[PDB]
Design a protein around this ligand. Structure first.
Ligand SMILES: [Zn+2]
Length: 352
């Protein structure tokens, strides 16, 4: 019930101070690293892009794991879609500071990746108890991992910043008109977009990223401009997204040996949550006193995506995150059985 869920949220608060304290450490090493690249290197126009769970105020676990994005302003970019993927692109340019990594017209992800990796190893040795370590490449993003005081892992993604208007594959995405309004949609789509190096599954492809927009929505999320700015307009949208993330995290924990749920990530949960916000656009559909109902809305929609094997990227609707090419049918059916069981029994995974 809604009291069991409120107890989970209270338990998650006990971890607030360790996450924020660790975020202070990350920021200290990141600003130091950033000012070496910024001063003099092949990545001079670099800048910090403050995105990810922590900056969205929905990081509720893993105080030793942070994702950080560096952005790189580039001269005007021309894109070329990789086959019919809708999310993966080759980068071209319409005498620029990236000429080093070009191969003909195409900007080489793996070459730029490789210099970035080396340039940071070189500047890291000069930084107090911080090292570079290699996790699974995952297509090139995260591009490099830092280990701060040999305790905190910081995954750092290099992202190109394009101030051009969004690619065609986003035209029907970001369907926030009935929720956040058409005015907000136009305003958000005048913002830049980002490209992160990412194998599409041998190629030099990049994938669109809209983390800065996901942060904007999450921190300005009501139909009312004053949603969550006073006690009469405290909604439970964020509490539901935190509970969805914690649900998945706790389920993955119960399979740490075989790791059957390894392919599922909080990005999947976050994408499904944005679709529910679109489907339930009124702030009264997220009254704090209806927490148990809104959480059920989030869980059944997430079950529906697993059963239909369809979870469309919130910005690129033809990019299906749950297609069998990415997540096999068997993993989705296994996660469906667990979540179904938990939903029908008032979430015994949350019992103390
Ligand atoms: Zn709110």
């Amino acid at each position: 019930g809604a009291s069991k869920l409120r107890a989970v949220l209270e338990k998650l608060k006990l971890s607030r101070d360790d996450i924020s304290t660790a975020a202070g450490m990350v920021k200290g090493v990141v600003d130091h690293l950033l000012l070496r690249l910024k001063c003099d290197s092949a990545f001079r126009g670099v800048g910090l892009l403050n995105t990810g769970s922590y900056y969205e105020h929905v990081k509720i676990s893993a105080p030793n794991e942070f994702d950080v994005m560096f952005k790189l302003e580039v001269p005007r970019i021309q894109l070329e879609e990789y086959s019919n993927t809708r999310a993966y692109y080759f980068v071209k340019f319409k005498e620029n500071p990236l000429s080093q990594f070009l191969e003909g017209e195409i900007l080489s992800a793996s070459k730029m990746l490789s210099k970035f990796r080396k340039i940071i190893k070189e500047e890291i040795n000069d930084i107090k108890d911080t090292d570079v370590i290699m996790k699974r490449k995952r297509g090139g993003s995260p591009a490099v991992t830092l280990l701060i005081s040999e305790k905190i892992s910081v995954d750092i993604t290099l992202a190109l910043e394009s101030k051009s208007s969004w690619p065609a594959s986003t035209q029907e995405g970001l369907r926030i008109q009935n929720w956040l309004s058409a005015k907000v949609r136009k305003q958000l789509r005048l913002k830049p977009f980002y490209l992160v190096p990412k194998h599409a599954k041998q190629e030099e492809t990049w994938r669109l990223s809209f983390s800065h927009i996901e942060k904007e929505i999450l921190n300005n999320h009501g139909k009312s401009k004053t949603c969550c700015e006073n006690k009469e307009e405290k909604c439970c949208r964020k509490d539901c997204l935190k509970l969805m993330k914690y649900l998945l995290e706790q389920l993955k924990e119960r399979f740490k040996d075989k790791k059957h749920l390894d392919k599922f990530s909080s990005y999947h949960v976050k994408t499904a949550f944005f679709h529910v916000c679109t489907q339930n656009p009124q702030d009264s559909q997220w009254d704090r006193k209806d927490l148990g109902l809104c959480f059920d809305n989030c869980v059944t929609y997430f079950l529906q995506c697993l059963r239909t094997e369809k979870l469309e990227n919130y910005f690129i609707p033809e990019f299906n995150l749950f297609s069998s090419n990415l997540i096999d049918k068997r993993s989705k059916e296994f996660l469906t059985k667990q979540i179904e069981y938990e939903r029908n029994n008032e979430f015994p995974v949350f019992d103390e």
